[PDB]
């Protein structure tokens, strides 16, 4: 397939690795009583391992000659679940955090001693600003349009 | 008149009640800036009218065919049908026809009265009006633009937007169309809800 | 007093401790419900 | 309505300066100072008045069915397991309906605490309304059909104190029933008969 890689659901090395891990777990499982707690924990680990391999196989990942999954990040539409969609989620969350921080700093700077409100948080004020990160992409865009996001170079100084 | 979306809450200072549909609802302070308010006022009307049209033309054919007087596919399959022209041609026609009308609408938002003139026949124009509510040709029967009618339009548009969101979400979990989902709820009301859908 | 204890509970290290504890709990529970994820498979 | 010469929870002790025997049921008990600031005092009063009525409703519906079953008039099952049985619909589908219906009333009550007197009128028919005049004590044909809530400020305080004390008792009774069911392993009414049969050995130390 892409870059000489093979789908993990059809890779012999992938199945070999799964079998080796399951055998290694079963060798430890064969040391305890069937109804003891360690046996149940090892059995749960075995079931989890089988589920992990099955999900990797059926989610469309690609495997190399080593028998391990590899990620594709060039933009191909068959692999957006690997980088692009989680990346959009990361950007959304990070923008929320940054936007609420900047809005708190701007709202608090008008007081007599703003620094006192930076080592002791005003939770009453922050609890009104936290929910507003929900629409940060709209607010930031509108603020950029109207020229409220950036300070002119002439005005920057201590 | 100006009501309250939440009985017992104070209204924002910038929502004094000079706009149709004012109910003091802006918890996240999107419209604190006066210009943002105008932009959102226009966007509300546009997204709402499109949603109303979409819901009507998305629901009526289904019930018409289910009655038995027509044989048409569901709304989520009509894009995969046989038409006299391919989908690409229709998209290109749509894009070309819409760039013109949308920039024409944009130029009036930027400065009212700028694009009232007819380009070809230099004898027709639009009399003075308010942005979002033109008249003349766009009002053939020449109804009365009273405050009551604007509120009646806004209420149905706001309802239609939620209806379209509901259709979109209900298709991605059930996959059987709106009317089938309604009849399933009406068959066993206590055993057919969203809870049974996920379990 | 209640005013003073509410003021002390709002100091930076205490609030950081509480916030990070809650976030860690949320992430641990999510990883217990949807374990061993390398991609986003829903859509 | 200050009344320093009133019984307290601990004779010989000084009552806190923020309690002066105005509210019904006041006995000068607040060791941890959770109501020193007057703003939170109203919130605490409302919370107690709500917990009390919930506990009273729970207690009145948790012992009488058990007593009737013990006598044999009714055949209701154990209260401690009735949540895990099967009913006409799914148990999860009842919780959401409960949430919606109770949330309407909870928000309607919440609006009155912040803005008193702002939710006293029926939203549909603007003629019918409630005659209550104090926060937490509404009044009308819906909540006071007999008309016992209108009296001089002598019987009103005594009735409120009666309600507060009958609710404070039930608040402890419900938790006691829960702990007994979890620890003893049988019904609550059976525990009373066990204690009245051998009142020297049938106690908590028996297990
Ligand atoms: C300089 C490196 C570079 C850059 C900047 C891009 C950029 C892009 N590539 Mg990639 N690509 C590259 C190199 C690069 N590629 C190389 C070298 C190859 C050959 C192996 C490919 C093969 C490739 C394929 C096969 C595809 C892309 C696609 C894309 C697009 C995905 C964007 C998108 O829809 O995000 C989504 C963002 C939001 C929804 C927000 C984007 C324009 C995809 C596309 O549709 O391109 C038009 C696509 O199908 N690329
Ligand atoms: C309000 C928070 C905030 C915001 C919006 C920014 C924004 C920015 N920072 Mg700054 N920064 C912050 C806090 C913040 N910083 C803090 C607390 C530190 C001390 C560690 C730094 C240290 C720092 C460095 C060393 C650099 C930047 C840089 C940058 C720029 C690029 C982004 C970057 O590299 O970030 C990287 C920054 C971090 C990983 C630091 C952690 C940021 C935290 C998580 C922010 C939120 C914490 C805060 C307590 C939340 C309060 C919430 C409120 C409701 C009470 C950008 C202008 C870079 C720059 O100059 O680019 C041109 C750069 O080199 N920042
Ligand atoms: C948002 C507006 C909108 C759009 C984009 C469409 C689009 C479509 N309609 Mg619909 N329709 C609309 C509004 C709309 N309709 C309205 C307001 C009505 C009046 C109730 C109808 C009544 C209608 C009928 C009766 C039929 C369509 C059909 C169609 C399809 C082919 C006709 C065509 O577009 O040429 C196409 C998917 C035809 C089809 O095959 O639908 C599946 C069809 O039979 N439409
Ligand atoms: C506002 C219009 C509206 C109406 C009348 C319905 C009606 C229905 N929906 Mg739908 N739904 C809506 C909006 C609506 N939905 C929206 C906005 C969403 C996205 C969150 C969904 C998501 C959804 C799912 C995922 C499912 C349904 C299902 C159902 C059916 C069973 C009831 C149920 O479980 O609801 C569940 C309700 C919700 C998830 C949220 C509803 C939120 C709306 C805005 C409340 C409207 C309140 C308003 C006062 C009601 C007016 C009633 C009437 C006068 C129009 C029922 C026919 C189920 C089905 O298909 O059963 C066969 C089902 O599985 N709906
Ligand atoms: C930059 C470094 C980096 C990166 C990119 C990763 C990435 C990853 N690590 Mg690794 N890791 C790292 C460093 C890193 N790690 C380090 C330094 C250590 C040592 C301390 C580890 C130790 C480690 C372990 C032990 C494990 C991982 C695992 C993982 C995976 C976690 C996936 C997950 O939990 O998804 C699920 C989580 C989420 C989706 C996050 C959701 C966040 C919130 C709740 C979103 C809310 C959105 C909200 C609803 C709004 C949207 C809706 C909108 C409509 C408003 C992922 C591939 C785990 C794994 O499975 O690997 C294969 C795993 O077991 N890592
Ligand atoms: C806090 C109030 C409360 C709550 C949550 C419940 C809840 C319940 N009661 Mg109870 N009940 C209450 C007060 C309450 N009761 C009161 C005040 C009385 C009068 C003494 C009763 C008398 C009563 C009877 C006679 C029965 C229930 C039963 C039930 C169950 C089904 C209810 C139904 O079908 O409707 C349910 C566990 C039924 C049950 O347990 O079915 C197995 C049942 O038979 N209740
Ligand atoms: C007012 C409520 C109340 C009442 C009347 C009773 C009564 C009884 N309980 Mg119960 N109990 C209660 C509250 C109550 N309990 C509470 C709050 C708890 C949790 C701490 C428990 C935990 C509990 C256990 C674990 C056991 C009992 C048991 C018993 C029985 C034997 C006495 C005993 O060992 O007490 C032990 C007492 C306690 C562990 C603490 C009691 C604390 C409350 C506040 C005392 C209130 C006294 C009250 C003011 C006196 C006047 C009442 C008035 C109506 C006249 C008896 C029928 C035993 C049983 O089942 O015997 C068959 C038993 O095993 N109770
Ligand atoms: C169901 C019942 C179960 C059993 C219940 C047992 C209750 C036993 C109570 C014992 C008696 C306690 C009396 C406390 C009175 C208030 C004390 C006080 O003011 O604390 C308040 C003080 C500090 O608070 C300061 O008090 C000052 C008094 O002049 C000023 O008011 C200051 O403004 C205030 O900040 O807290 C402590 O000293 C706490 C020490 C222990 C740590 C907790
Ligand atoms: C114990 C309790 C609260 C106790 C509080 C205490 C001691 C506080 C003490 C102090 O703060 C003071 C005053 C002053 C401070 O200075 C000092 C301290 C010491 C800090 C609440 C219980 C509160 C208990 C409540 C609300 C219980 C509700 C129960 C219900 C509704 C039950 C319903 C059902 O039983 C039915 C009817 C039928 C069944 O089939 C189904 C179910 C659901 C089981
Ligand atoms: C207002 C407000 C807020 C809330 C905002 C909210 C909830 C906004 C919600 C907005 C929504 C749902 C908008 C939805 C718009 C939907 C639109 C335009 C839908 C259009 C649909 C069309 C053209 C459909 C075409 C078709 O179907 C047909 C016809 C026939 C089919 O064959 C083909 C397709 C294409 C499917 C907060 C953010 C919460 C706080 C703030 O402070 C105040
Ligand atoms: C694929 C994506 C394509 C995107 C294409 C569209 C890009 C649109 C860019 C809009 C830029 C808006 O911001 C840009 O103009 C603002 C003025 O309007 C500038 O704002 C500046 O001038 C304003 C007056 O006009 C002052 O009030 C501001 O204090 C000053 O910063 C911003 O410093 C500049 O960055």
């Amino acid at each position: 397939d892409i870059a000489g890689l093979t789908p993990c659901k059809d890779s012999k090395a992938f199945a070999k690795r799964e079998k080796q891990s399951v055998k290694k777990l079963t060798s430890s499982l064969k040391k305890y009583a069937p109804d003891s707690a360690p046996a149940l924990a090892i059995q749960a680990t075995i079931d989890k391992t089988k589920r992990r391999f099955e999900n990797y196989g059926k989610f469309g990942l690609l495997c190399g000659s080593d028998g391990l999954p590899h990620l594709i990040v060039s933009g191909d539409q068959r692999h957006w679940g690997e980088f692009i969609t989680p990346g959009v989620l990361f950007l959304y969350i990070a923008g929320w955090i940054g936007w609420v921080g900047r809005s708190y700093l701007i709202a608090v700077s008008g007081e007599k001693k703003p620094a006192m409100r930076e080592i002791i948080i005003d939770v009453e004020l922050a609890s009104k600003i936290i929910p507003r990160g929900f629409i940060w992409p709209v607010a930031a865009y509108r603020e950029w349009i109207n020229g409220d996001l950036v300070v002119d170079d002439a005005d920057i100084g201590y | 008149a100006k009501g309250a979306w939440l009985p017992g809450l104070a209204s924002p200072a910038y929502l004094d009640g000079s706009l149709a549909g004012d109910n003091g609802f802006d918890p996240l302070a999107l419209a604190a800036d006066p210009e943002d308010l105008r932009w959102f006022v226009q966007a509300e009307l546009v997204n709402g009218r499109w949603a109303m049209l979409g819901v009507a033309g998305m629901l009526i054919p289904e019930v018409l065919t289910k009655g038995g007087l027509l044989n048409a596919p569901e709304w989520y399959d009509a894009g995969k049908g046989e038409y006299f022209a391919s989908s690409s041609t229709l998209f290109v026609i749509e894009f070309i026809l819409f760039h013109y009308v949308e920039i024409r609408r944009w130029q009036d938002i930027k400065n009212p009265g700028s694009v009232n003139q007819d380009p070809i026949f230099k004898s027709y124009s639009l009399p003075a009006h308010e942005c979002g509510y033109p008249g003349s040709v766009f009002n053939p029967l020449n109804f009365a633009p009273t405050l009551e009618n604007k509120e009646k339009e806004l209420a149905n548009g706001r309802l239609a937007m939620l209806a379209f969101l509901g259709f979109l979400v209900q298709h991605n979990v059930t996959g059987k169309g709106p009317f089938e989902n309604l009849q399933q709820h009406l068959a066993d009301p206590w055993h057919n809800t969203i809870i049974q859908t996920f379990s | 007093s209640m005013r003073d204890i509410k003021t002390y509970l709002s100091v930076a290290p205490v609030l950081s401790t509480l916030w990070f504890g809650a976030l860690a709990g949320l992430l641990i529970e999510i990883n217990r419900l949807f374990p061993d994820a390398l991609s986003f498979p829903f859509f | 309505a200050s009344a320093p010469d009133r019984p307290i929870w601990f004779p010989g002790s000084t009552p806190p300066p923020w309690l002066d025997g105005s509210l019904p049921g006041d006995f000068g008990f607040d060791p941890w100072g959770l109501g020193s600031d007057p703003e939170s005092l109203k919130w605490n009063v409302q919370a107690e008045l709500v917990h009390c009525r919930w506990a009273m409703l729970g207690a009145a519906g948790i012992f009488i069915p058990e007593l009737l079953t013990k006598i044999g008039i009714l055949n209701t099952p154990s209260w401690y397991t009735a949540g895990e049985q099967e009913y006409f619909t799914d148990t999860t589908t009842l919780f959401v309906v409960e949430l919606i219906l109770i949330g309407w009333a909870e928000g309607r009550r919440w609006a009155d605490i912040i803005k008193p007197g702002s939710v006293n009128t029926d939203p549909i028919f603007p003629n019918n309304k409630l005659t209550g005049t104090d926060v937490g004590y509404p009044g009308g044909l819906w909540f006071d059909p007999l008309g016992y809530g209108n009296a001089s400020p002598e019987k009103l305080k005594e009735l409120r104190t009666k309600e507060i004390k009958n609710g404070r008792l039930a608040m402890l009774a419900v938790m006691g029933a829960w702990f007994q069911a979890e620890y003893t392993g049988t019904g609550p009414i059976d525990n009373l008969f066990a204690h009245l049969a051998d009142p020297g050995h049938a106690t908590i130390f028996r297990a």
Side-chain angles (χ1 to χ4, degrees), chain A residues 97-105 117 121-122 126-127 129-130, chain C residues 15-16:
Chain A
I97 299 175
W99 192 250
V100 297
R102 174 179 182 269
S103 50
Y104 182 85
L105 276 186
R117 240 61 187 93
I121 305 299
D122 183 8
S127 72
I129 294 178
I130 278 179
Chain C
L15 199 58
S16 305

Side-chain angles (χ1 to χ4, degrees), chain D residues 91-114:
Chain D
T91 44
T92 310
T93 64
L94 297 165
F95 183 52
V96 177
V97 177
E98 162 195 344
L99 271 180
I100 298 172
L101 293 181
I102 255 59
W104 177 263
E106 285 282 288
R108 194 72 175 181
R109 177 171 78 87
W110 201 347
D112 194 297
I113 299 179
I114 297 181

Side-chain angles (χ1 to χ4, degrees), chain A residues 61-94:
Chain A
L61 294 178
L62 296 176
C63 275
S65 294
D66 49 6
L68 301 176
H70 291 195
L71 305 188
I72 307 290
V73 302
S74 63
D76 189 306
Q77 291 176 24
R78 291 168 288 184
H79 299 277
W80 278 22
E82 295 168 359
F83 182 72
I84 290 185
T85 314
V88 170
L89 193 61
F90 178 88
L91 293 185
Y92 184 67
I93 295 181

Side-chain angles (χ1 to χ4, degrees), chain C residues 1-34:
Chain C
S1 67
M2 184 129 300
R3 177 199 305 174
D4 282 8
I5 195 68
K6 287 175 173 301
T7 307
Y8 174 78
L9 288 180
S10 301
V11 90
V14 178
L15 199 58
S16 305
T17 299
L18 299 170
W19 192 254
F20 286 135
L23 172 64
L26 176 68
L27 292 175
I28 290 169
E29 301 284 9
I30 289 181
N31 268 275
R32 190 183 60 168
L33 289 174
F34 305 87

Side-chain angles (χ1 to χ4, degrees), chain D residues 9-96:
Chain D
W9 74 284
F10 191 43
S13 177
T14 61
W18 51 87
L19 303 178
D20 60 329
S22 304
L23 307 141
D26 194 326
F27 295 112
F29 178 70
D30 196 12
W32 290 12
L34 303 178
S36 61
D37 44 332
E39 189 71 9
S40 60
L41 187 58
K42 302 176 297 183
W43 185 262
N44 294 337
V45 167
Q46 299 302 323
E48 173 176 302
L49 188 49
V50 171
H51 271 82
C52 281
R53 285 165 176 166
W54 276 126
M56 268 187 294
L57 279 184
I62 209 176
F63 293 116
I64 301 181
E66 301 285 346
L67 175 62
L68 298 177
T69 303
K70 194 72 173 185
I71 297 182
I73 305 179
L74 192 49
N75 291 20
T76 43
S78 177
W79 72 266
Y80 189 77
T81 57
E84 74 180 5
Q85 295 189 2
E86 293 189 6
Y87 301 88
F88 73 100
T89 177
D90 186 9
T91 44
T92 310
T93 64
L94 297 165
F95 183 52
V96 177

Side-chain angles (χ1 to χ4, degrees), chain A residues 48 51-52 56 59 81 119-121 123, chain C residues 10-12 15 35-36 38-41:
Chain A
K48 193 188 185 67
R51 173 194 180 183
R52 166 170 69 258
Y56 285 172
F59 280 162
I119 61 170
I120 299 179
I121 305 299
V123 185
Chain C
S10 301
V11 90
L15 199 58
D36 302 328
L38 277 179
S39 70
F40 192 87

